[PDB]
């Protein structure tokens, strides 16, 4: 049989890229870490450096307290029981304040309190991060895509967490933390909203999330089936197209009827996959606000 | 008409089937015999599915809704109005997908290029026929298959789904969901990354390669490199299929209950599952 | 009502984005053309994209796209037909000629150049701490055709500096001049290196390389597309 460049043949090693300077401020990057033989029959097998800077030490420090936050509650509503924490790890729940305390930041720390607090924690963690996926790229002399499309994702979690129970008058309608408590909020909020399926930005949500799988399985196989032509290189292929960028784009054209370019499918990627979270927050912001029943007002309108 | 490079590519050769008798292109299409066939079964189900809407009387797309037998019908054939429209239509959908998957590997021939593609869109296929043909038989009809319709077969996820409760707690659908949203995850990181070094801040030269890993490992302590990348989005995508495939193949064959009794094998176990306090004490 | 109103500008939006993407996706290979190389008057409902420049790191120039196209070199091929859809055969060797999947591209003559401006591929002879970390060690094995003869041995391993990957294997014929041979075309085993797409005695066709420390893009493209040739037209031997 030929062989497929799924796993590499011969991993080859050495001496560590400590990687561009740029304007990147050395003084907040690491050590270069360990190699890793297991991860060099996939991928690369360096580890590290990584930059931690202001930002960086915030969002890491927010992000413990919101875990740390969690865990302490976890282990109360365990009884401090190391064999029940394990065995109901799963289906703790830390809730939000009852309905009776509507946005107010006053209740008790057993009752909605220490979810506040953990929201607060988490609120600092995630707008941390994504200033700092702004930064690296800004002291790179990068393009600011990656911080964008992360504020897709951030704008679904806000809507969940923060826009949608606010415009409701209540912290009660957010999610809680909980492995299983989470699923069955979900599953409780398609139910009291009438069929989130019928929720037309639900329908567009799933359509490029599977979408989504349907474009990197498409360009994933397609770029390891042109890199005997050197075609995983793409930068290059941008600047000075070669035959491996051709007959990439030939093979979709002669099957479907059209094509991309190099830096042409990676925006039609960027925006599957923003879109996902883009259309599925509106879906969130306007249940319960605007629309009580999708599946009503679909058979109207 | 041609892309300007294209004319040195469009030499003789590749066909598995056939010779050079089907070797030609219509447009930008490539045919070959498994684009004949491709048209041939894409045009009997188009046509049945038009039948099927002047039986069910409506030309709405939101409306038509092909059946399949009801589950009284076992795995027999069934009258066209009563199901047999569904099964001929499910014939051609899988001749059709088939055909277009050795289109395509005829397609990497003349290209000379690796055949992963159709090996990808294979895995796609086989969440279809696992729905449509080995989860159904291994529960003894085709009725409970889902139905084509843009609505219906909607109503069709959340009937099945609701069966077994929240469909949540099926382990496999788990693993599932956890692919396809890293997947998008992967996605979306990996067009910014790819983006952002071809279209650096204004007044800046075009970045390198170098600079995508740098980025990488400054964020995260790792980057997985070119290759990697595109070997970790096919791997997550087809991961998600699969584990589709695989949480559906197990619900109603080996699996009939409300999923979330799955999860007492964890809770239950005989040792902390008396303790009292926690949630199931 | 709010939604119908978001769904309907949801719609507006999306129609925007697909018209905008299928354009940046028109900046190579656009306009079409008629099989004899001249403008086809059919040249989609989307209009070519407005030109844009990329600045190449290092002194290398800039690239206008979309722009002036041509392939700078001759194509040995010929119409099978008066009407268009048919094949082009070669006229030639298609494999010495570069056409079908024996194709290369004219890319610039010069190495793809790191972030600091050295070269990406090095054989490993002239990269400093460079070595097999795991898997079969090929330096030495036998190289082997699909005509189970042996072609030569090899001699190094060519190198992505920044990625840390095999990229080429360099390999002597009995004459004592060497080859690249792409990663991704090798079968690496315990005892020898199997390279299905070529017989032995079409490892010399591979095209050479001027120095024998770098490879520029030219060269990559050349020796990729004849190696990846062979699978169709070394196939009857
Ligand atoms: C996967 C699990 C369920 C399922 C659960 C859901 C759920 C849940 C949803 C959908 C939704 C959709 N599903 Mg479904 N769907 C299933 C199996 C299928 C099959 C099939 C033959 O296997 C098909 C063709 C579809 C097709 C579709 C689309 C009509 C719609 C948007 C999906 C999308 O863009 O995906 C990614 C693909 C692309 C981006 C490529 C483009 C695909 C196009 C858009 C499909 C057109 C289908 C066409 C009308 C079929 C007729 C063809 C002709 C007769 C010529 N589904 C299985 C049974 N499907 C969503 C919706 O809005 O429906 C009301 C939605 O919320
Ligand atoms: C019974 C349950 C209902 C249902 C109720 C809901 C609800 C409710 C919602 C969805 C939502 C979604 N549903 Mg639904 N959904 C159902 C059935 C389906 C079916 C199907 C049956 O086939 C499908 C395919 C889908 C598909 C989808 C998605 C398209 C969408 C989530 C997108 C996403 O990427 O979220 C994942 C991404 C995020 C949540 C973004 C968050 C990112 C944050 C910022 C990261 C924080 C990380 C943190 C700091 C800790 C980890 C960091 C570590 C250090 C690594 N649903 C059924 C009908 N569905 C969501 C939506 O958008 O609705 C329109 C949503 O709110
Ligand atoms: C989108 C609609 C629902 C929702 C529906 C689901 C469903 C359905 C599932 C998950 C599952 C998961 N969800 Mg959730 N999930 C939601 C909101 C969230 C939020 C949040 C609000 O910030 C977070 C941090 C998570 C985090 C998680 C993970 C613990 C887990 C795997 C996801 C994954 O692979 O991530 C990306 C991976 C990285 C490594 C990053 N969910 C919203 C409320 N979530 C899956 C699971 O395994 O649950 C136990 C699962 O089946
Ligand atoms: C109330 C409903 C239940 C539920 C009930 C079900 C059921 C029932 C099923 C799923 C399945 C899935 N659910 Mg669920 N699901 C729920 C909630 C969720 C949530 C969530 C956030 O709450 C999420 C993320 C998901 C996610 C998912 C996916 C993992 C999986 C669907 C993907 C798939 O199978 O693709 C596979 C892709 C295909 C089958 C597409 C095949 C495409 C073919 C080959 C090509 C078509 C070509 C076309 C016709 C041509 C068009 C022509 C032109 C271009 C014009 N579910 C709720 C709790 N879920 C399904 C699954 O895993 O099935 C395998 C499944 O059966
Ligand atoms: C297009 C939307 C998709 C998406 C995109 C996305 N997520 C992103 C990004 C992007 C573009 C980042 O740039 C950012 C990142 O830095 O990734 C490595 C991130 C991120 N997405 C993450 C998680 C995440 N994304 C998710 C979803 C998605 N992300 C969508 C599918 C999910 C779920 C539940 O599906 C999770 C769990 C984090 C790994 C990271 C944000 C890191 C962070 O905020 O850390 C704070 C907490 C700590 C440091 C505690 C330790
Ligand atoms: C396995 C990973 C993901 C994936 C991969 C994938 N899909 C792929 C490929 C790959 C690699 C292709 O190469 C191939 C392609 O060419 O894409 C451009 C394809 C493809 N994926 C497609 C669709 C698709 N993929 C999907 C999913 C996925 N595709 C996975 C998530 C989905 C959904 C529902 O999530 C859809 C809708 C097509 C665009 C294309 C295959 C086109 C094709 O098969 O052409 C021949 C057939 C026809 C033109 C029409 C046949 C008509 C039938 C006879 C009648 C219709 C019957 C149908 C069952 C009724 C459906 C009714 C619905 C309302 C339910
Ligand atoms: C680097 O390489 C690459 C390219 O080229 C350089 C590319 O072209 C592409 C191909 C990908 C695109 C052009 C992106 C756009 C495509 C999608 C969003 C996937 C969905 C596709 C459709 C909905 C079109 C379906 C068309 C069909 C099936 C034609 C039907 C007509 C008949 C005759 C029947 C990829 C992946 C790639 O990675
Ligand atoms: C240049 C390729 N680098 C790279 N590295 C990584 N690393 C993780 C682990 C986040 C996937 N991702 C990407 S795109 C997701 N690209
Ligand atoms: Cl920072
Ligand atoms: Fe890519």
Redesign the interface.
Known sequence: AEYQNIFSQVQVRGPADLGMTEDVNLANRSGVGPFSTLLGWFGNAQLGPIYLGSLGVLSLFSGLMWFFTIGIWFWYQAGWNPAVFLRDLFFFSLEPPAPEYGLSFAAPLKEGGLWLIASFFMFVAVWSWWGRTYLRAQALGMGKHTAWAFLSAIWLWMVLGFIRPILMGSWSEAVPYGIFSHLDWTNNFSLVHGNLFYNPFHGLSIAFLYGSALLFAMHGATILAVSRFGGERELEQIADRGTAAERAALFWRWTMGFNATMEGIHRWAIWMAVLVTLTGGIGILLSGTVVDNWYVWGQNH | ??????????????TLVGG?LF????????VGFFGVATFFFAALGIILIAWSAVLQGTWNPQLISVYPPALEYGLGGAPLAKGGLWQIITICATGAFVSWAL??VE???????????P???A??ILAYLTLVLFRPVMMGAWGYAFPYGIWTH??W??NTGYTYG?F??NPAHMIAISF?FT???????????????????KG????????????F??????????????????????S??FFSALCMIITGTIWFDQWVDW?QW??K?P???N??????? | DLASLAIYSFWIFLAGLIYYLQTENMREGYPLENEDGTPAANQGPFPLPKPKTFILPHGRGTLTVPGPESEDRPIALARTAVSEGFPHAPTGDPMKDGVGPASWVARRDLPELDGHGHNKIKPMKAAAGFHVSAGKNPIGLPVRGCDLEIAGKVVDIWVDIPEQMARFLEVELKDGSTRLLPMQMVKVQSNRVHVNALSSDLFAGIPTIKSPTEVTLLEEDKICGYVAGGLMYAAPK
């Open positions: 008409a041609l892309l300007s490079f294209e004319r040195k590519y469009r030499v003789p050769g590749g050079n070797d030609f292109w219509v447009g930008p299409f490539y289109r395509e397609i990497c021939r003349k290209l000379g290029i690796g055949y992963h593609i090996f990808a869109f895995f796609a909607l109503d996820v959340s929240n949540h707690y396809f997947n998008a995850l992967a996605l979306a990181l990996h067009g910014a990354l790819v983006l952002s070094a071809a279209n650096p801040e800046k030269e075009m970045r390198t390669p170098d600079h995508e890993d740098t980025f490992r400054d964020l995260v302590g790792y980057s997985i490199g070119t290759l990697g990348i595109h070997r970790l989005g096919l791997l997550l995508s087809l998600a299929v999860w964890w809770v176990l040792w902390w599952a303790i009292p306090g926690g949630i199931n004490g």
